[PDB]
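During the second year of the project, the team shifted from modelling isolated chains to modelling whole assemblies. The rationale, set out in the original proposal, was that interfaces cannot be judged from single-chain predictions alone. As a representative example for this report, we include one of the complexes processed in the last quarter. Its constituent sequences, exactly as entered into the pipeline, are reproduced here:
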Amino acid sequence: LMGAGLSDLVLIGPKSVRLYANTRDGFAKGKDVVQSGEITLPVPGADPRKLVAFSDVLGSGQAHLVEVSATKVTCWPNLGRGRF
Amino acid sequence: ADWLFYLVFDYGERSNNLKTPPAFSTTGSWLCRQDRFSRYEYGFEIRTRRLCRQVLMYHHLQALDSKITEHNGPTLVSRLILNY
Amino acid sequence: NNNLAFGAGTDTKTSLQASVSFADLKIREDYPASLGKIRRIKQISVTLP
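Output from the structure prediction step:
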């Protein structure tokens, strides 16, 4: 989520994410990132009828948060540092 | 008025056919590409939705030559067509 | 019985209720009668996606 090529530790809630940056020897102090506007994020594992995963579906070179259901695919862009 | 040479990048704003040269000064919209894409590594969406269709070179012949009046526009001396 | 509504208690009016009829779930129909007629609930768990 830092966009550093490293895997950061994160917990996703619907309005915020708790992010611990990977500093390549351990992790950084966790930060709570509050999402802007009225953005609501999917929480993986929350609903058995849909897939929630981090993947690059825009082709930008960053994993984005993606929700796949029977009727649509919704992508929340990764703007870095836990911001969506 | 102050420059002798112009290099112009056309994003689909003016005709690129073989029947008439394009004018230096034109109007109208550019063309929107189908493979529109975005990038997020700078913390914001940067989105590309057009592409250069032709590159064309103009000379301010009025300024360069002698006995020239009217200043009707830079005159195309050559162009490059790009098809995609 | 198959409905959504707000409650009418004195401290439940802001409580959103959902109700269903067991009769309309057609659970019994899933298995043949010959396997027994006594069909009773042992446990219920709830998932809220």
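Chain A touches chain B at residues 3, 58-62, 77-81, 83 (CB under 8 Å). DSSP finds no helices and six strands in chain A.
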